[PDB]
Design a protein around this ligand. Structure first.
Ligand SMILES: [Mg+2]
Ligand SMILES: [Mg+2]
Ligand SMILES: [Mg+2]
Ligand SMILES: [Mg+2]
Ligand SMILES: [Mg+2]
Ligand SMILES: [Mg+2]
Ligand SMILES: [Mg+2]
Ligand SMILES: [Mg+2]
Ligand SMILES: [Mg+2]
Ligand SMILES: [Mg+2]
Ligand SMILES: [Mg+2]
Ligand SMILES: [Mg+2]
Ligand SMILES: [Mg+2]
Ligand SMILES: [Mg+2]
Ligand SMILES: [Mg+2]
Ligand SMILES: [Mg+2]
Ligand SMILES: [Mg+2]
Ligand SMILES: [Mg+2]
Ligand SMILES: [Mg+2]
Ligand SMILES: [Mg+2]
Ligand SMILES: [Mg+2]
Ligand SMILES: [Mg+2]
Ligand SMILES: [Mg+2]
Ligand SMILES: [Mg+2]
Ligand SMILES: [Mg+2]
Ligand SMILES: [Mg+2]
Ligand SMILES: [Mg+2]
Ligand SMILES: [Mg+2]
Ligand SMILES: [Mg+2]
Ligand SMILES: [Mg+2]
Ligand SMILES: [Mg+2]
Ligand SMILES: [Mg+2]
Ligand SMILES: [Mg+2]
Ligand SMILES: [Mg+2]
Ligand SMILES: [Mg+2]
Ligand SMILES: [Mg+2]
Ligand SMILES: [Mg+2]
Ligand SMILES: [Mg+2]
Ligand SMILES: [Mg+2]
Ligand SMILES: [Mg+2]
Ligand SMILES: [Mg+2]
Ligand SMILES: [Mg+2]
Ligand SMILES: [Mg+2]
Ligand SMILES: [Mg+2]
Ligand SMILES: [Mg+2]
Ligand SMILES: [Mg+2]
Ligand SMILES: [Mg+2]
Ligand SMILES: [Mg+2]
Ligand SMILES: [Mg+2]
Ligand SMILES: [Mg+2]
Ligand SMILES: [Mg+2]
Ligand SMILES: [Mg+2]
Ligand SMILES: [Mg+2]
Ligand SMILES: [Mg+2]
Ligand SMILES: [Mg+2]
Ligand SMILES: [Mg+2]
Ligand SMILES: [Mg+2]
Ligand SMILES: [Mg+2]
Ligand SMILES: [Mg+2]
Ligand SMILES: [Mg+2]
Ligand SMILES: [Mg+2]
Ligand SMILES: [Mg+2]
Ligand SMILES: [Mg+2]
Ligand SMILES: [Mg+2]
Ligand SMILES: [Mg+2]
Ligand SMILES: [Mg+2]
Ligand SMILES: [Mg+2]
Ligand SMILES: [Mg+2]
Ligand SMILES: [Mg+2]
Ligand SMILES: [Zn+2]
Lengths: 103, 144, 208, 159, 292
RNA sequence: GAGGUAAAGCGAAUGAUUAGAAGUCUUGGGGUUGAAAUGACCUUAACUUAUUCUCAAACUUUAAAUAUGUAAGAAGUCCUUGUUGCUUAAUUGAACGUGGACAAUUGAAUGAAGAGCUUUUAGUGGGCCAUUUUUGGUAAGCAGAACUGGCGAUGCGGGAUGA
RNA sequence: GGGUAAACGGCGGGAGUAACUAUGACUCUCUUAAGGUAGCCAAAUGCCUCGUCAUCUAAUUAGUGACGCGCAUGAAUGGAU
RNA sequence: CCUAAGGGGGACUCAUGGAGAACAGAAAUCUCCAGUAGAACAAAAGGGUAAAAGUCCCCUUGAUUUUGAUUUUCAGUGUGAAUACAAACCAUGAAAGUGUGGCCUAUCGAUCCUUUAGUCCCUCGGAAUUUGAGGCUAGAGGUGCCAGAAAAGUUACCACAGGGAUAACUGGCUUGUGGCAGUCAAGCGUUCAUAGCGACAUUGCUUUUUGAUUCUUCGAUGUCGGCUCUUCCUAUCAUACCGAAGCAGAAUUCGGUAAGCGUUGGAUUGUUCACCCACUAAUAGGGAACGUGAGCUGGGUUUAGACCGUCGUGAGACAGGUUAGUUU
RNA sequence: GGUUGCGGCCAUAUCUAGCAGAAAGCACCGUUCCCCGUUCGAUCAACCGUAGUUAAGCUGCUAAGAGCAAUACCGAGUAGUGUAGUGGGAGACCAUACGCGAAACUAUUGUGCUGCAAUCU
RNA sequence: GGCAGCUCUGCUACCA
């Protein structure tokens, strides 16, 4: 899958409310904070004796992930998110197909 | 089963009068393996109505023992007597529907003399079901 | 190897032919369907005799081969190899299946053999010959009947050879120039199409 | 493994008619549908948008909605022990006016015309349809038509 | 050696196209897109500006489609132009403009939208759409149907487009197919378009050819020579015609030298008639007999 | 209205398939011509043409029976003209209306211990058998589906006996 | 990174070849950490198997003695006596 | 899987065949004619498609935003997928139009938690500011047992609740397989189809084989074989009487009525089976809950001890071998 | 009646081989300054209607024409099928009773009809 | 998913 690094979609920002030029980037999940309430609760539950208190997922089945595009408006810097289908290979702004050539 | 219910034939040896059209003939064809029918004469109709004639009065089975019973229920259709009713059935009249529906289904006995050796095969093939066409009178004489 | 034929006598399954869906199917035992003087012209053999099925049934390719061989052997022995033209009129296109060659789990069988599905009144074998060779050809078919299961009738045809015309309509169309040879068969005149080609192909056509 | 996809089993239902493939004749696009019209549903295989499900192929219903290229049709489907009202969006290529309307709407006009004339003539007319009745008596002439006697024929083999 | 192709099975299974597709005259894809109307605008028709060019004529018709066949609203032909003062070049780009203006004015006369929606009375070649008047009926909307004719910038069909638009009809369009459109600099040079509207290209050809190849000028521009029409007075021929077209756009049918019955009787003499069944049967019998 | 099963068809498409016949080999070999000419001849095999025997659950032009959708009015039909920001070039339509006309043959049959509506809760969620259709299997008192009727849950007369 | 098997344990396949044939001392080839050594055996361990030969008997799927490409014998998981 | 293989527009016509053109030939490229699609359309198969949905070219991001309705599976719940609109904002085209991903039918995922985007809005409750945290709306990180626990073995030391819903006997249905018997008659038999046989086929019987099934029995019908004893069947090995021969005699072979009468002693093996030695008129085949264990015996199998080989890291396994093992 | 433009149904309209076509129309046809598109003004664009032609297109007619369409004392009330019996038959299957009812085949006939506008010997 | 060395080996980490 090859997706161009720019895109003109609708901007939901109050300033724009229209199709503007956007910059496309792949979304990357942030680092899990230690002070998130679910993390704070988990650490308290794990302390002391009792062993592992919550379940740990093992039976992985997916071999891909859904790629999310981060679209930042060049006018007002409002971001938007778009999930794509499951692809094993994804590049941003790769070389476009050239039809009519030999091996 | 639904066809026999719509002909008001919900027991064995129950008899009813039907006016022949395309619709009622195609009804009777469906019930043919379960019924014996034919063309009734005037004397057969008279004997049926006289001996086993009952009227549907307020959803009750009332004997036709007096002409006032017939008049109170069929005078708006110009039926004032048991003979008016017999005529209306026999010469299929403009008010055949009301007169035949007013008549409770006839509850006949078993034949005096029995049926043929095996009832449930067509009259043509030596049985009893289907259209026998003038021999319904002999059968009714046996059963009425 | 082969089960008794009683295991496959009746048309219990839908027709199961060779296709893109079953491919590893063996060949039928019968490969030759025309015997005797198959190149004889229509006028040489006026008499047709049929072996007709009185059964809705399945006949194995093995039985077809055996009956064909029996009839051919007898008729060539008694009257000569060129005194008749025998044709087998049923082709085994239905594949029989065998299971054993667990239990009932996964019991879909493998191809085992071939059979022809015949109806009542269906012709199994046809023999065109001369009239004087009737009793021989009949006796050739009557023996072949022993190789088949069920009931078969030997019926002398009303028609001229393997043609669809009676022995009288054929003579009428023959003396009227409406029949021409085509090798072992004939072509009949048509009153439709190009008039010139029709006239050229049937020069002796006494038009009315 | 069972397969129960949307268009399973529609191999022949959604086929075009023999020698009738290709472009749609434009009378299909010139018909006018109003709310309350009775329409037959027949999927056209060459238009895949707005296509009915295979259940509605061959069903007749009432138009309830009219859009740019489609009509909404109300269908009653049996689900267990009752009917459920189904609302199907269909492009007009899969829709045709039901010919049962035009016959009954003509009988309404004919009844109105017959009734008004009878009032003008001061007589009566009966407008209820009647089933076919048994035929009356008749006399069959045999001049040129003397009865020909037939017999069952003997058995013959024709092969 | 090879299989004969035109078998009876080939003919039996052949599905002939639509009659008017096999004639190569109707593009049914485009026709479906043009004709089909929004189903919630129930019986309101879509009106097409059918523009067709023959070798000698320009046909412009305003058409709405129905189940029994298309119905003409009005029609203007190029051979009507001599009535308005244009006698030669009845297939110019300018003749196309004149035909479009004529059909627009005639349609608006038929509807009653003459005083309202006059159009572009002073043709300067600027791109413009007929705007509706507030508190009044909307302009007659018409869609261009160029049929199988190719879309090129400078084509004559868009001459009828521009004429009809200037005549007061609302015909949706863009100016990037007009003569004088700069594709690199996406603006319309209205001077060159105005040149084309008033026969400027033809007049310039007359002037440029006269001083270079006089013999070809004598053959190509004969009618102008025997009409004493020079280049400088070419424009007025159109400029007056426009005015004349606006003065009386009503249709005047040609007075017919013969009646319908006379035409039919004359034409029926030159029409072979099918042989009776008996005639061809006798022919077959004779051909059989002469074969002996 | 819808359908593609039974049947039928295959000198109709696809696929399978028996036999000859007549042509072309110029883009098949063997032999015989040829001193060598690829230019003939005998042959088999190829194709081509018109025929011929036999077939298809996952082939088909055609195409049932049974089963199946809708309609058979008063919430209808017709006439006139009111509303809108929708729609039309519009005074066009769309939808919903005011007012007027059509009365029990108010628009097929037959039947109707009446129609409609609601709440709440039990048991059950092993099934089996018969006719017909039907799948696997050599078959099975075998395994699995379709429609109906039964047994289960049911005694009574008959089948000696028997869900 | 090194040591250690009287630690746990492990201890190979495919073709050709000698003035008949058979076998293969010999050679080639793949490959291991090493490729089962001394011994022993159809043994309480061998499937095929009631192995083959000898002896014992009139006759022995038993016994014993031989043989050994040993399904899957073998050295202090001790081998042979 | 695809930034096009999505969207719009335009132009063109495909597979293949024939006839022609230097090298060039069966296959290079060019030309004409024929060509209903016999091509192609990402991927299964089916449907669909010819001035296109196919091939090539031009422009693009509608594969966008907001939240409702509907179809399928359906409980008319969820998920997936799809349909027709409303309100925006766009692409494309002269335009009508078309476009809310892929021509259609598959290509996918809850609560809790985390993370990002949006609103920069609400809350941190004695009052504020700034960090931090918590909320609201939409995605993503995943459960493939796919309406979604967090999870290795062994038990031959074993336990419990049950199950004839279910295996290991007999019995019952069936008879493929096993066994036995016919019909036809190409051949064999010096000649000669049928004395004796008999291919290619085809019809049966039997329940002495083994399967198939799972109806009965799991609050138990004592599961191998032998010994002992009785009886029955006949598809007859012997004995009685006979018919046939490729019957000279003798011997033998084929067949009929026949179950009256008999059908053995041993070596090896737990064996059923087998295989030899020997006698004999003959050493036929079977059934009776695969007769027969409150009749026996207990060699085998199949509790617990123990050894070996192979397998396993191990506990242990072996339908492999071996030895000892309460018979009321 | 012919012809053109736009059509409806979408072969009774298609296909093959011949022949004819007055008037108008349509068509082929001529040219390259201009808008435009190509390897190629062949297609597409524009210009002239001037120099020519019915040769082709188009239209009609012909053919025991191919195909297609329709019809039927054609085949055939056949094949199939709903319902029934303590019908036949070891079975495979079959007959009968009350109903529905083909396809192929055969024969005959036909070979576009038509709406709006304009135009014409 | 973090470190680190030679497309990658080693160690460490594990609530959907
Ligand atoms: Mg703590
Ligand atoms: Mg804890
Ligand atoms: Mg701790
Ligand atoms: Mg008595
Ligand atoms: Mg009796
Ligand atoms: Mg079966
Ligand atoms: Mg199992
Ligand atoms: Mg269809
Ligand atoms: Mg789509
Ligand atoms: Mg177009
Ligand atoms: Mg079919
Ligand atoms: Mg089907
Ligand atoms: Mg069939
Ligand atoms: Mg057919
Ligand atoms: Mg075929
Ligand atoms: Mg409950
Ligand atoms: Mg429950
Ligand atoms: Mg159960
Ligand atoms: Mg119960
Ligand atoms: Mg009962
Ligand atoms: Mg009793
Ligand atoms: Mg009995
Ligand atoms: Mg060694
Ligand atoms: Mg050893
Ligand atoms: Mg041992
Ligand atoms: Mg001993
Ligand atoms: Mg020994
Ligand atoms: Mg030893
Ligand atoms: Mg070892
Ligand atoms: Mg050691
Ligand atoms: Mg060891
Ligand atoms: Mg694209
Ligand atoms: Mg695409
Ligand atoms: Mg296009
Ligand atoms: Mg739903
Ligand atoms: Mg859903
Ligand atoms: Mg799904
Ligand atoms: Mg637009
Ligand atoms: Mg849109
Ligand atoms: Mg959160
Ligand atoms: Mg507070
Ligand atoms: Mg506080
Ligand atoms: Mg998620
Ligand atoms: Mg998870
Ligand atoms: Mg689960
Ligand atoms: Mg689940
Ligand atoms: Mg445990
Ligand atoms: Mg164990
Ligand atoms: Mg059980
Ligand atoms: Mg058996
Ligand atoms: Mg058997
Ligand atoms: Mg056997
Ligand atoms: Mg011999
Ligand atoms: Mg059991
Ligand atoms: Mg038990
Ligand atoms: Mg006991
Ligand atoms: Mg006991
Ligand atoms: Mg005996
Ligand atoms: Mg004997
Ligand atoms: Mg005895
Ligand atoms: Mg012993
Ligand atoms: Mg037994
Ligand atoms: Mg026992
Ligand atoms: Mg005992
Ligand atoms: Mg005991
Ligand atoms: Mg023991
Ligand atoms: Mg033990
Ligand atoms: Mg080990
Ligand atoms: Mg002891
Ligand atoms: Zn913005």
């Amino acid at each position: 899958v090859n997706v161009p690094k720019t895109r003109k979609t609708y901007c939901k920002g109050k300033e724009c409310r229209k199709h503007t030029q956007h910059k496309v980037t792949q979304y990357k999940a942030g680092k899990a904070s230690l002070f998130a309430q679910g993390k704070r609760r988990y650490d308290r539950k794990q302390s002391g004796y009792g062993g592992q208190t919550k379940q740990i997922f093992h039976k992985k089945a997916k071999t891909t992930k859904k790629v999310v595009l981060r679209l930042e408006c060049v006018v007002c810097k409002t971001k938007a998110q778009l999930p794509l289908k499951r692809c094993k290979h994804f590049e941003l702004g790769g070389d476009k197909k050239q039809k009519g050539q030999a091996l | 089963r639904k066809v026999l219910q719509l002909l008001r034939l919900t027991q064995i040896n129950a008899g009813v009068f039907v006016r022949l059209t395309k619709a009622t003939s195609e009804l009777i064809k469906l019930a043919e393996p379960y019924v014996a029918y034919g063309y009734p004469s005037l004397s057969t109709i008279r004997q049926l109505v006289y001996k086993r004639g009952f009227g549907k009065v307020n959803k009750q089975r009332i004997a036709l023992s007096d002409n006032a019973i017939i008049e109170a229920n069929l005078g708006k259709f110009n039926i004032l007597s048991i003979e008016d009713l017999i005529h209306e059935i026999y010469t299929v009249g403009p008010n055949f529907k009301q007169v035949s529906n007013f008549l409770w289904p006839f509850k006949l006995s078993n034949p005096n003399g029995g049926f043929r050796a095996r009832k449930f095969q067509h009259f043509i093939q030596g049985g009893d079901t289907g259209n026998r066409e003038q021999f319904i009178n002999a059968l009714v004489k046996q059963m009425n | 190897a082969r089960r008794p034929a009683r295991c496959y006598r009746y048309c219990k399954n839908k027709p199961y032919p060779k296709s893109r869906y079953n491919r590893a199917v063996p060949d039928a035992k019968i490969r030759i369907y025309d015997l005797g003087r198959k190149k004889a012209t229509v006028d040489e053999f006026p008499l047709c005799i049929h072996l007709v099925s009185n059964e809705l049934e399945q006949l194995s390719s093995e039985a077809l081969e055996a009956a064909r061989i029996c009839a051919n052997k007898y008729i060539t022995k008694v009257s000569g190899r060129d005194s008749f033209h025998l044709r087998v009129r049923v082709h085994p296109f239905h594949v029989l299946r065998i299971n054993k060659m667990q239990g009932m789990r996964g019991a879909w069988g493998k191809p085992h053999g071939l059979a022809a599905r015949v109806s009542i009144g269906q012709i199994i074998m046809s023999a065109r010959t001369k009239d004087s060779n009737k009793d021989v050809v009949i006796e050739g078919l009557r023996r072949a009947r022993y190789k088949f299961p069920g009931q078969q009738k030997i019926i002398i045809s009303k028609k001229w050879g393997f043609t669809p015309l009676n022995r009288d309509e054929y003579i009428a169309k023959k003396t009227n120039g409406e029949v021409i040879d085509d090798g072992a068969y004939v072509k009949f005149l048509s009153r439709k199409g190009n008039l010139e080609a029709n006239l050229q192909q049937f020069p002796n056509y006494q038009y009315s | 493994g069972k397969s129960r996809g949307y268009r399973s089993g529609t191999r022949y239902a959604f086929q075009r008619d023999f020698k009738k493939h290709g472009a749609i004749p434009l009378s299909t696009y010139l018909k006018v549908y109003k709310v309350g019209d009775i329409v037959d549903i027949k999927a056209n295989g060459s238009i895949q948008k707005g296509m009915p499900h295979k259940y509605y192929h061959g069903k007749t219903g009432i138009v309830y909605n009219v859009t740019k290229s489609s009509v909404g049709v109300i269908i009653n489907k049996v689900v267990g022990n009752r009917y459920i009202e189904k609302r199907v969006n269909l492009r007009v290529e899969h829709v045709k006016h039901s010919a049962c309307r035009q016959e009954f709407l003509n009988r309404v006009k004919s009844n109105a015309a017959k009734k008004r004339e009878a009032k003008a003539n001061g007589e009566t007319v009966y407008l209820k349809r009647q089933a076919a009745k048994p035929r009356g008596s008749r006399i069959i002439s045999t001049e040129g038509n003397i009865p020909q006697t037939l017999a069952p024929v003997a058995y013959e083999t024709f092969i | 050696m090879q299989k004969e192709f035109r078998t009876s099975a080939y003919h039996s299974r052949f599905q002939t196209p639509f009659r008017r597709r096999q004639e190569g005259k109707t593009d049914y894809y485009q026709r479906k897109r043009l004709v089909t109307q929004h189903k919630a605008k129930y019986n309101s028709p879509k009106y097409r500006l059918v523009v067709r060019f023959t070798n000698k004529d320009i046909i412009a018709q305003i058409v709405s489609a129905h189940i029994t066949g298309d119905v003409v609203f009005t029609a203007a032909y190029a051979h009507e132009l001599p009535r308005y003062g244009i006698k030669y070049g009845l297939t110019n780009w300018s003749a196309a403009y004149a035909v479009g203006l004529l059909v627009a004015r005639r349609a608006l006369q038929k509807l009653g939208l003459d005083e309202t929606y006059t159009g572009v009375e002073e043709v300067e070649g600027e791109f413009e759409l007929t705007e509706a008047v507030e508190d009044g009926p909307r302009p007659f909307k018409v869609f261009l149907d160029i049929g199988l004719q190719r879309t090129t910038t400078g084509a004559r069909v868009f001459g009828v487009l521009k004429g009809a638009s200037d005549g007061g009809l609302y015909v949706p369009h863009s100016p990037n197919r007009f003569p004088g459109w700069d594709i690199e600099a996406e603006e319309l040079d209205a001077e060159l378009l105005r040149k084309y509207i008033f026969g400027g290209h033809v007049a310039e050809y007359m002037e440029e050819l006269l001083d270079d190849d006089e013999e070809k000028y004598k053959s190509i521009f004969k009618n102008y020579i025997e009409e004493e029409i020079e280049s400088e007075d070419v424009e007025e021929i159109y400029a007056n015609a426009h005015e004349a077209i606006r003065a009386d756009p009503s249709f005047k049918p040609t007075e017919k030298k013969f009646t319908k019955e006379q035409y039919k009787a004359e034409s029926k003499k030159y029409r072979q008639q099918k042989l009776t069944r008996a005639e061809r049967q006798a022919k077959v019998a004779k051909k059989i007999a002469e074969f002996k």
